[PDB]
Design a protein around this ligand. Structure first.
Ligand SMILES: *[C@H](N)[C@H](C[C@@H]1CCNC1=O)NC(=O)[C@@H]1CC2(CCCCC2)CN1C(=O)[C@@H](NC(=O)C(F)(F)F)C(C)(C)C
Ligand SMILES: *[C@H](N)[C@H](C[C@@H]1CCNC1=O)NC(=O)[C@@H]1CC2(CCCCC2)CN1C(=O)[C@@H](NC(=O)C(F)(F)F)C(C)(C)C
Lengths: 306, 306
């Protein structure tokens, strides 16, 4: 028992991280087979970070303008192209550490692990969710761009995120591995801002089930609610709506604990109207919304990866 | 910016994990050079989990009673010995993936990353602290014993924890890698219990400095306090005492933010007496005590490992 913010083991991804230098900018790249992926703003100059023309900027580069370091071994670039907001650097060596992988794009509400890197060297791993407003509440400093987010399914790494920028509230924006931004953000230094977020309702319910599995029951009650009546309360507390599909996804957790989903909704309803009154759930004094129903089952049931 | 519960990259440790079977018990072992380390209760039988005699139990075993699987490759045991509460299984192959390493024992208040494993296969990574009562608030299920806790310093893994058991409040107890338990716990199924914990004061202060670095300032105040007067307030809230050495360790964070340590103590004092009044710090509604001053500097300054 116990419940922790759990990331995937990072070893398969660590063996893909490299350092990409263009001019005086150094950031991280992801080396899979004979291609290195990195944020295209690596080619941006200090003179015009405000409104670059990346097509123009890239046509002025040669292969030799990209220094790629895999550890203490330099990789020769033999081709380059732009795909949306990422650069694809063709190199003359396939990464022998290439895992089985996919490029997948995730939905707001889903979670992933981030391997933060500087100078091609992994610094730390942590778990994030895609917020409803398409930001992620990350932990990133200068030089972290090109760090990736990922999920693991048995032996296969599903890459879902590459880091590109930090917004003025301290949250982060980036792309999928095809270079397409999550949300309405661009890789220029404009006045963009996150815009209003909501709480991921289905995930809070998942985490309440985790608490019950782990012996926190104090927030349970004998009441129930209709889905419609629950959602009227959710709207007022800036929670997002719960759907019948969310109820279906919570089925296994409902069956394990014996607590009907709509009964748990009635408990969440009372938590929202009354607060927690000096008590905690799973060591938190807030309702936690960055665990999916999958995350809870995995952690409380013990799935591994190989 | 941003602040996350950050674990170390786990790849160096993933390459050391193996599966150890004796009888009908399977758990995890740590393979370094030609030795596999695992919890000695792997040899315990179901008949007498209550009060085993491990010397007696081990003298009745042969090398061939230990099945060790490194992935899908079986390792031949060529010797075995007991060191305190761990078993040292000598095998006929050195782990070619052995990192530079040390066996270190940590202090309550210090943090480490845990690579949870089942059947020799890594499941997830998360960050823990050694509690003042020598438990850790982990996340562990059946078969997780032999998972290790560790810190990384450049290229060198400092192993500090091996998992052995779960106590009745859902917290966890284990040994250092020499087999010596943290705290007053034994590897028998008796009625042992955690005993009362305290909050790690210096770590809360570190995390308040992290918040200021990240732009949360609302809890600051114009007041100050003496160390003695602060500790009178700490005792009453079950915080542990703050020492001049703790004040010295917080020096760098004090200098970066311009907030004197004792000034931050006055802010913590008011937080303890008034609560947080519906506000949050670094996304938490509780005072967080599982980040050390080192953790904060590392995350807010960007140290890597290679
Ligand atoms: C990548 N190494 C870096 C990550 C970033 C530094 C601080 N914390 C982080 O997560 N990305 C950047 O510095 C990008 C690159 C930039 C925009 C594209 C053109 C070249 C310069 C500036 N930048 C930023 O993240 C900006 N943020 C913005 O422009 C935004 F607010 F999003 F519009 C700054 C202000 C430097 C954080
Ligand atoms: C290791 N695979 C396992 C980890 C544990 C299972 C559930 N969550 C966990 O962290 N360890 C055990 O099962 C140990 C082994 C045990 C004690 C030594 C002799 C052989 C049997 C039983 N055990 C336990 O953790 C106990 N706990 C206790 O005995 C304690 F409370 F600590 F005294 C049980 C009750 C099974 C959790």
């Amino acid at each position: 028992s116990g419940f922790r913010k759990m990331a995937f083991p990072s070893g398969k991804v660590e063996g893909c991280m490299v350092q990409v230098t263009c001019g005086t900018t150094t950031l991280n790249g992801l080396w899979l087979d004979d291609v290195v992926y990195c944020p295209r703003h690596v080619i941006c100059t200090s003179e015009d970070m405000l409104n670059p023309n990346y097509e123009d900027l890239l046509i002025r580069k040669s292969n030799h303008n990209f220094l790629v370091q895999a550890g203490n071994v330099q990789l020769r670039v033999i081709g380059h192209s732009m795909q949306n907001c990422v650069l694809k650097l063709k190199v003359d060596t396939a990464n022998p550490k290439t895992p089985k992988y996919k490029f997948v794009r995730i939905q707001p509400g889903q979670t992933f692990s981030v391997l933060a890197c500087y100078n091609g060297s992994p610094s730390g791993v942590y778990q994030c969710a895609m917020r409803p407003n398409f930001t992620i509440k990350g932990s990133f400093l200068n030089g972290s761009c090109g760090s990736v987010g990922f999920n693991i399914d048995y032996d296969c790494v599903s890459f879902c995120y590459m880091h590109h920028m930090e917004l003025p509230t301290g949250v982060h924006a980036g792309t999928d591995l095809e270079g397409n931004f999550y949300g309405p953000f661009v890789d220029r230094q404009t006045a963009q801002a996150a815009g209003t977020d909501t709480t991921i309702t289905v995930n809070v319910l998942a985490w309440l089930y985790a608490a019950v599995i782990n012996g926190d029951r104090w927030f349970l009650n004998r009441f129930t609610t209709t889905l419609n009546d629950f959602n009227l309360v959710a709207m007022k507390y800036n929670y997002e709506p719960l759907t019948q599909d969310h109820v279906d996804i919570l089925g296994p957790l409902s069956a394990q604990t014996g607590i009907a989903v709509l009964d748990m909704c009635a408990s969440l309803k009372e938590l929202l109207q009354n607060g927690m009154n000096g008590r905690t759930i799973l060591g938190s004094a807030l309702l936690e919304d960055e665990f999916t129903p999958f995350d809870v089952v995995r952690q409380c049931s013990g799935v591994t990866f190989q």
